Design a protein around this ligand. Structure first.
Ligand SMILES: CN[C@H]1C[C@@H](N)[C@H](O)[C@@H](O[C@@H]2O[C@H](CO)[C@H](O)[C@@H]3O[C@]4(O[C@H]23)O[C@H]([C@@H](N)CO)[C@H](O)[C@H](O)[C@H]4O)[C@@H]1O
Ligand SMILES: CN[C@H]1C[C@@H](N)[C@H](O)[C@@H](O[C@@H]2O[C@H](CO)[C@H](O)[C@@H]3O[C@]4(O[C@H]23)O[C@H]([C@@H](N)CO)[C@H](O)[C@H](O)[C@H]4O)[C@@H]1O
Ligand SMILES: [K+]
Ligand SMILES: [K+]
Ligand SMILES: [K+]
Ligand SMILES: [K+]
Ligand SMILES: [K+]
Ligand SMILES: [K+]
Ligand SMILES: [K+]
Ligand SMILES: [K+]
Ligand SMILES: [Mg+2]
Ligand SMILES: [Mg+2]
Ligand SMILES: [Mg+2]
Ligand SMILES: [Mg+2]
Ligand SMILES: [Mg+2]
Ligand SMILES: [Mg+2]
Ligand SMILES: [Mg+2]
Ligand SMILES: [Mg+2]
Ligand SMILES: [Mg+2]
Ligand SMILES: [Mg+2]
Ligand SMILES: [Mg+2]
Ligand SMILES: [Mg+2]
Ligand SMILES: [Mg+2]
Ligand SMILES: [Mg+2]
Ligand SMILES: [Mg+2]
Ligand SMILES: [Mg+2]
Ligand SMILES: [Mg+2]
Ligand SMILES: [Mg+2]
Lengths: 54, 117, 69, 88
RNA sequence: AUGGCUGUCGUCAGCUCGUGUUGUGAAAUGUUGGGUUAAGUCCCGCAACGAGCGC
RNA sequence: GCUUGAGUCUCGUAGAGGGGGGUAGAAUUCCAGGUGUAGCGGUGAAAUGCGUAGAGAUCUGGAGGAAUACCGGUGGCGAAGGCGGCCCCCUGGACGAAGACUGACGCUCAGGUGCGAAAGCGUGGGGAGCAAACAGGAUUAGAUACCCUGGUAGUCCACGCCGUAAACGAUGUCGACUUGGAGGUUGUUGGCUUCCGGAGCUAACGCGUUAAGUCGACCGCCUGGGGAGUACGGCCGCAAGGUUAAAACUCAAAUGAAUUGACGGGGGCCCG
């Protein structure tokens, strides 16, 4: 998925910043796990927010 | 005295009680009111209507200042969530902003045990 | 939930929009679940209960189509 | 686990060929190499019980292959335990 | 010990049986179900089909 | 001897598998203030408690511990116990593909050995939150409880000990065989997994190719309810206790599943 690919990863987070379920987006299980890792790495590097507050 | 044109209504809406504090944008309190100290105790205190009055009284606390427009910060699961905001809108404030700032641990600390009744 | 009220936006719209965004983020659900400690045994028990009923909804719902009353 | 090159050295030395990966010599030699390598790991990581179960399987497998080779070919057995420096 | 007579649940909508079928069996089904009625009232569906006492 | 069981090698795959070291964000608490003023907190209702010595609320900064929202799934991994933020280091197993290789090297396993939730124990640390004990407030005929306000062991870490749980699928391990249907997950037709169901089996409930069916190998265990998993002895343990394990005596039952009622401070739907 690439943690650096911010435009992609923003398709898979809500307005609050929370990771969107696979049930909602129709993502395959294998890619949901890879997506989850990418977002969490991006959140660490401060390329994405954890929360809409901060 | 110092006419603040823009402030923030902080609504602490717990299950038991509602606290409205108006601040400036930097978060220094101007005036507050609560459901508990507005002639409502117990069953009455934890209503939308008791939070309704607390909103009204907090407006008429901060009238020394001329707050044109209130940003609003809502915190907690109580029945003074919405009734406070409507009441402030019908005290002649321009609500520019509504925000939920209810704190959510990202796990955090172990909560108290479940009540058996 | 962090509404920014728009230019010439009416109040009820913004308020109902705050209501919808609050129900969306699942805030009041999360405050309620985090109010008291649920043991892992209890959590797994209710998670299995939700799984069982959901699947068991279908087996009865999808035997309702081809059944006359 | 034992690397491609480390593996391939042992297969060459104890085998009849580099394709003779199957022989009891090669199997026992490869087990001995990993058992000895892991003694470094379990010195540092004493509470790595899950990995240690894997080591004890290697030890057990080596014992079984040596007992087979003893009763099959006692000559080859003696050479093997001498080369690898094993008691039995 | 009883007959007869009477109260009560309550004029509440119940209570049963034959035959068939299901179950090793106690039993079940019918009498449940969808609608409807003051009503086990009626229609419709239905391994039940009929019947009696009630209504 | 042989290659079909079992294993080795080669390439790839998924994974909260394990051990070690870092680190991130959210939140709670505390401390320091800035603003501010009479309440806060709590319950069925209260009260104890906190608060004009300025609480609660709100803003800023700091400290510290513990746990990782969302992702998240009858999803995955592990022998079982169990394992969930992110990053690195060390490390175990599983699965698949297509060959090559060894040549029955196998299965099971009394005794033995190892691992083994939570609580508990020892020594040294740590201590936010939670909380046995304890204290106070209520409730009550009483209330050594449930409820409330607090709160110490403990929960966390290192090392050692303990060795037990409804440690459960209440279902030993290995292998073979025997109609189907709908899914999940993971490879290139295989592996793992969820639900339903056929024959068959079952006292019934149910189980049903992941068998509780049809067979074979080996182990463990049972022999009425109590007495009793107790006593005594042995072994183990720092202790708590664990483990092995009787007898007298006593009763004609105890028990499983299912059936019809009745009943529920169970649910639904109705009437007077
Ligand atoms: C996977 N890496 C782990 C490696 C261990 N050596 C750590 O002790 C562990 O860390 C601990 O995790 C637990 C959760 O299982 C708590 O979270 C502890 O609190 C922590 O981590 C502590 O303490 C740390 C400090 N001790 C500094 O390292 C940091 O403050 C962390 O942010 C904080 O979560 C790490 O996670
Ligand atoms: C005879 N050697 C094999 C023995 C098997 N028991 C291993 O599982 C296998 O290991 C695997 O190898 C493949 C290639 O054929 C990949 O490399 C896998 O990725 C690995 O090995 C995995 O996964 C490991 C993890 N399973 C943890 O040990 C570690 O991450 C290793 O660094 C990593 O190479 C070895 O190769
Ligand atoms: K039966
Ligand atoms: K009959
Ligand atoms: K951590
Ligand atoms: K591996
Ligand atoms: K043996
Ligand atoms: K404490
Ligand atoms: K056995
Ligand atoms: K007896
Ligand atoms: Mg409470
Ligand atoms: Mg018959
Ligand atoms: Mg009847
Ligand atoms: Mg009639
Ligand atoms: Mg009928
Ligand atoms: Mg690993
Ligand atoms: Mg413990
Ligand atoms: Mg201790
Ligand atoms: Mg407490
Ligand atoms: Mg308490
Ligand atoms: Mg450690
Ligand atoms: Mg036991
Ligand atoms: Mg368990
Ligand atoms: Mg279980
Ligand atoms: Mg058992
Ligand atoms: Mg079945
Ligand atoms: Mg004993
Ligand atoms: Mg003893």
């Amino acid at each position: 998925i690439d943690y650096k690919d911010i435009a992609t990863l923003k398709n898979y987070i809500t307005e609050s910043g929370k990771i969107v379920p696979s049930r909602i987006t129709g993502t395959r299980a294998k890619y949901q796990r890879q997506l989850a890792r990418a977002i969490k790495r991006a959140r660490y590097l401060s390329l994405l927010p954890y929360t809409d507050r901060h | 005295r110092k006419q603040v044109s823009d402030g923030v209504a902080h609504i602490h809406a717990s299950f038991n009680n509602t606290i409205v504090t108006i601040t400036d944008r930097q978060g220094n309190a101007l005036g507050w009111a609560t459901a508990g100290g507005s002639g409502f105790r117990g069953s009455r205190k934890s209503t939308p209507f008791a939070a309704q009055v607390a909103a009204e009284r907090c407006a008429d606390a901060v009238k020394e200042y001329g707050i044109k427009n209130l940003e609003v910060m809502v915190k907690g699961p109580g029945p003074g969530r919405e009734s406070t905001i409507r009441a402030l809108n019908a005290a002649g404030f321009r609500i520019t902003n509504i925000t939920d700032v209810t704190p959510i641990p990202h796990x955090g600390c172990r909560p108290p045990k479940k009540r058996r009744v | 939930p962090v509404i920014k009220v728009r230019e010439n936006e009416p109040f009820d719209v913004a308020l109902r929009r705050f209501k919808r965004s609050c129900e969306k983020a699942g805030v009041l659900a999360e405050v309620r679940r985090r109010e008291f400690y649920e043991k892992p045994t209890t959590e797994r028990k209710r998670a299995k209960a939700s799984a069982v009923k959901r699947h068991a909804k279908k087996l009865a719902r999808e035997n309702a189509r081809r059944t006359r009353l | 686990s034992l690397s491609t090159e480390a593996t391939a050295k042992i297969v060459s030395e104890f085998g009849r060929d580099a394709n003779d990966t199957g022989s009891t010599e090669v199997q026992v030699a490869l087990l001995t190499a990993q058992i000895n390598h892991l003694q470094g790991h379990f010195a540092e990581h004493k509470k790595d019980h899950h990995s240690r179960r894997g080591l004890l399987r290697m030890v057990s497998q080596r014992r079984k292959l040596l007992d087979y080779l003893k009763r099959k070919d006692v000559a080859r057995y003696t050479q093997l335990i001498e080369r690898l420096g094993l008691r039995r």
